[PDB]
Amino acid sequence: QPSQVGTYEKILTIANRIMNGGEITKEEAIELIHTSDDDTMILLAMADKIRQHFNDNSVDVCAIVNARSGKCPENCKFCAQSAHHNTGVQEYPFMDEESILQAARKAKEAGAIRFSIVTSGRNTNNPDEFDQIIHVLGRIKNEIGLEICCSLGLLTYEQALKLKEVGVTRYHSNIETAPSHFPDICTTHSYEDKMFTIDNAQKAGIRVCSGGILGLNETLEQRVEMAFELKRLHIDSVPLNILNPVKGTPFESNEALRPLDILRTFAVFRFILPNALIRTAGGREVNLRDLQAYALKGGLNGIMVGGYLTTGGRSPQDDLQMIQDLELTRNT
Amino acid sequence: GTYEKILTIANRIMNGGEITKEEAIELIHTSDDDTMILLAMADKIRQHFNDNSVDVCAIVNARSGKCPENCKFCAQSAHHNTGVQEYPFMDEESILQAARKAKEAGAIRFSIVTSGRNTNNPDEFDQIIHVLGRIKNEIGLEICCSLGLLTYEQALKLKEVGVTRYHSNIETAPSHFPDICTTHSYEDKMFTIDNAQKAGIRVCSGGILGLNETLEQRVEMAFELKRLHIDSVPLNILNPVKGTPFESNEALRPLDILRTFAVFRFILPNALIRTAGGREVNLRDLQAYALKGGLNGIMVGGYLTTGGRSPQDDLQMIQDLELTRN
Numbered sequence: 001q002p003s004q005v006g007t008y009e010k011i012l013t014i015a016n017r018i019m020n021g022g023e024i025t026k027e028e029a030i031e032l033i034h035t036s037d038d039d040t041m042i043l044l045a046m047a048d049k050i051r052q053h054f055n056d057n058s059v060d061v062c063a064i065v066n067a068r069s070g071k072c073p074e075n076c077k078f079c080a081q082s083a084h085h086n087t088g089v090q091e092y093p094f095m096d097e098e099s100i101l102q103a104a105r106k107a108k109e110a111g112a113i114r115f116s117i118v119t120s121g122r123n124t125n126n127p128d129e130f131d132q133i134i135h136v137l138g139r140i141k142n143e144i145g146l147e148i149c150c151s152l153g154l155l156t157y158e159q160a161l162k163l164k165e166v167g168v169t170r171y172h173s174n175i176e177t178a179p180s181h182f183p184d185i186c187t188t189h190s191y192e193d194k195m196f197t198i199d200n201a202q203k204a205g206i207r208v209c210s211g212g213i214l215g216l217n218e219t220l221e222q223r224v225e226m227a228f229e230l231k232r233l234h235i236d237s238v239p240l241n242i243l244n245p246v247k248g249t250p251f252e253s254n255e256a257l258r259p260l261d262i263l264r265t266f267a268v269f270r271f272i273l274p275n276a277l278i279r280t281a282g283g284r285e286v287n288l289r290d291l292q293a294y295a296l297k298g299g300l301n302g303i304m305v306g307g308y309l310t311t312g313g314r315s316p317q318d319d320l321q322m323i324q325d326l327e328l329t330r331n332t
Numbered sequence: 333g334t335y336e337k338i339l340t341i342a343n344r345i346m347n348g349g350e351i352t353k354e355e356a357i358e359l360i361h362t363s364d365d366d367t368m369i370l371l372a373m374a375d376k377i378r379q380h381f382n383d384n385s386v387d388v389c390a391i392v393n394a395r396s397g398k399c400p401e402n403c404k405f406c407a408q409s410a411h412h413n414t415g416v417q418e419y420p421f422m423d424e425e426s427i428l429q430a431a432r433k434a435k436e437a438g439a440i441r442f443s444i445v446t447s448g449r450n451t452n453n454p455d456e457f458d459q460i461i462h463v464l465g466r467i468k469n470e471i472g473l474e475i476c477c478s479l480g481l482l483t484y485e486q487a488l489k490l491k492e493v494g495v496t497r498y499h500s501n502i503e504t505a506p507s508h509f510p511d512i513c514t515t516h517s518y519e520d521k522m523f524t525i526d527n528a529q530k531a532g533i534r535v536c537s538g539g540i541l542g543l544n545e546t547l548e549q550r551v552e553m554a555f556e557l558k559r560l561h562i563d564s565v566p567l568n569i570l571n572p573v574k575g576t577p578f579e580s581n582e583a584l585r586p587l588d589i590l591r592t593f594a595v596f597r598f599i600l601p602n603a604l605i606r607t608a609g610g611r612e613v614n615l616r617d618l619q620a621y622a623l624k625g626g627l628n629g630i631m632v633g634g635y636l637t638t639g640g641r642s643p644q645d646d647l648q649m650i651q652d653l654e655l656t657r658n
């Protein structure tokens with residue numbers, strides 16, 4: 001005479017606990033990231049409910065420009081732009097400011113409300129390039145009216161002050177993977193170098209955007225470790241890339257993830273970080289295909305449009321239509 | 333928990349119970365915020381009573397235009413100026429070429445579809461029988477057909493040649509049928525369904541969302557399919573045709589469509605429920621939601637007077653949802 005309960009009850013219980021002020025434990029998150037295919041839609045649904053409980057129904061749209069491309073001394077095993085790997089990538093110096101402003105203007109027409117200057121290379125060690133970056137970041141913000149981001153690699157405290165002064169509101173630095181996996185993906189810089197960078201940005205009063213890449217041979221457990229590590233670092237802006245394997249790099253042959261594995265991972269990040277702005281970045285179109293729309297009703301509330309650094313995306317108008325079709329709104 | 337009743341009703345159904353009309357009306361009004369819980373529960377009901385396969389079908393427009401029926405939605409009606417291609421029953425070799433293409437595209441079954449009230453000329457009908465035979469026996473697809481109003485004697489002949497699905501949409505709820513057609517009636521459809529069933533053929537019957545029905549009428553439509561023991565249900569979404577009285581009907585919101593699909597699954601837990609016409613146009617990048625939100629079949633390869641996307645994309649999507657084919 002007791003009704004039979006479904007396999008997905010724990011998902012409901014935990015979601016309720018979080019929406020009532022509790023927190024998921026590591027063991028719980030590990031269980032949830034192993035959710036079945038059959039129960040995945042309940043997990044995604046409950047992530048969407050957590051998202052709604054702690055945030056509005058807006059989707060934050062960003063876009064980037066590869067303002068300086070290729071020729072990087074770092075050996076990050078996934079990156080097209082490393083010198084240790086022949087990938088046939090475009091190489092060029094810092095774009096001229098009018099060219100950058102054009103891209104800024106296109107990103108705004110496309111529906112981005114914030115825009116990142118991204119450069120290859122460890123850091124920006126020449127103080128003249130840095131100065132050019134500051135100059136054009138200012139023009140973007142004051143003349144185009146976009147919030148400004150940047151991804152400049154390793155960052156000193158003095159640089160972060162300057163970024164803060166010119167009006168940067170997100171400083172991007174990805175942890176890439178779980179601390180326990182970072183040695184297996186890069187050796188020319190360390191995890192510690194990422195901590196320094198992130199700390200320096202935070203101490204200058206800049207909200208840090210930090211995430212990483214699913215599909216680097218991390219275990220599911222390590223994806224959970226990565227989320228809690230972001231929690232530790234007080235990160236509330238999280239871009240989740242999915243590896244786009246680059247011919248010539250060592251991760252060329254990395255096995256593709258199953259779309260539902262990716263979507264489950266997104267949902268579990270939401271459970272672990274209920275108040276964060278969590279977004280897709282690289283690899284969305286190619287690795288989620290016709291399931292991309294699941295992300296924004298499965299725990300994510302941001303999207304990078306207009307393509308990436310050395311890899312493309314779909315038309316941003318299709319992305320704006322998808323947001324509308326999901327009955328979500330566009331931020332700011 | 334604003335979505336608690338969704339969970340309770342779903343669990344009741346999976347423990348052997350039935351949704352009430354009143355409850356179905358409430359569920360079809362689920363908020364946007366609660367829509368994913370509804371789709372999830374419909375996915376659980378689909379899994380509980382069926383399996384994890386997606387049935388892939390395709391069609392050919394074998395005879396086009398010049399229909400004396402005045403269905404307000406239909407491009408092939410003669411009462412409406414619509415610019416539709418008109419042609420009599422296609423030649424065997426063309427039809428077989430279309431069937432080969434469908435099979436290559438991943439369809440397990442294939443429908444000869446005709447404009448018209450019916451086929452009255454017994455010779456034209458035998459031509460239909462002849463080619464149905466060659467499709468099944470030579471190309472090796474299961475065979476469906478959609479020939480309009482059907483007599484018992486016609487149904488026996490289709491059974492004999494090996495037709496495994498006879499298609500005849502009810503289109504809408506009985507209470508809305510007069511508002512879409514007056515050259516034939518709702519009861520005309522009821523005789524056709526009975527005739528096909530009594531000959532031993534599984535009937536495939538659904539209809540069209542977006543014909544100005546109320547949400548309540550969509551529920552009525554599902555309950556009628558329930559009463560009729562229909563277990564193969566194609567859910568079309570109106571593609572408004574220029575020149576028809578419904579050319580200016582408003583598009584439905586994707587989530588409204590998906591909520592409707594989910595509610596049909598709650599009412600018909602055991603049924604093979606598929607998308608048909610207007611899927612790509614009206615669901616766009618939310619099409620994938622249907623197969624993890626209550627549906628378990630898909631029509632690929634485009635329609636009668638309207639196209640579809642690449643079937644390979646459709647097959648990839650099935651695979652990406654961790655579903656199988658058969």
Ligand SMILES: C[S@@+](CC[C@H](N)C(=O)[O-])C[C@H]1O[C@@H](n2cnc3c(N)ncnc32)[C@H](O)[C@@H]1O
Binds near residue numbers: 246
């Ligand atoms: C951070 S930007 C370059 C700026 C600077 N060099 C740095 O390392 O911060 C390059 C970022 O794109 C992502 N990325 C690079 N190659 C990728 C690939 N093949 N697939 C997916 N994401 C990738 C990584 O997460 C990486 O943090």
Ligand SMILES: C[S@@+](CC[C@H](N)C(=O)[O-])C[C@H]1O[C@@H](n2cnc3c(N)ncnc32)[C@H](O)[C@@H]1O
Binds near residue numbers: 406479501570572
């Ligand atoms: C049923 S077949 C034609 C065979 C036969 N004349 C009959 O009415 O049964 C045509 C089917 O396509 C669907 N259909 C027609 N025009 C449509 C449109 N504009 N949008 C969506 N579905 C449509 C209807 O459900 C209709 O039953």
Ligand SMILES: C[C@@H]1NC(=O)N[C@@H]1CCCCCC(=O)O
Binds near residue numbers: 151308
């Ligand atoms: C820098 C942006 N922020 C982020 O987390 N990834 C974006 C870049 C992704 C690059 C994808 C691979 C390529 O285009 O080379």
Ligand SMILES: C[C@@H]1NC(=O)N[C@@H]1CCCCCC(=O)O
Binds near residue numbers: 391501539566567610
């Ligand atoms: C006959 C098939 N089965 C069904 O229920 N609908 C299909 C036809 C869809 C037609 C869409 C509009 C057109 O192409 O004219």
Ligand code: SF4
Binds near residue numbers: 075081122
């Ligand atoms: S991710 Fe950054 S640091 Fe690593 S190789 Fe690419 S450009 Fe260099």
Ligand code: SF4
Binds near residue numbers: 400401403406446
């Ligand atoms: S009976 Fe069939 S072909 Fe004729 S108008 Fe109606 S749907 Fe169109």
Ligand code: NA
Binds near residue numbers: 623625627
């Ligand atoms: Na389903």
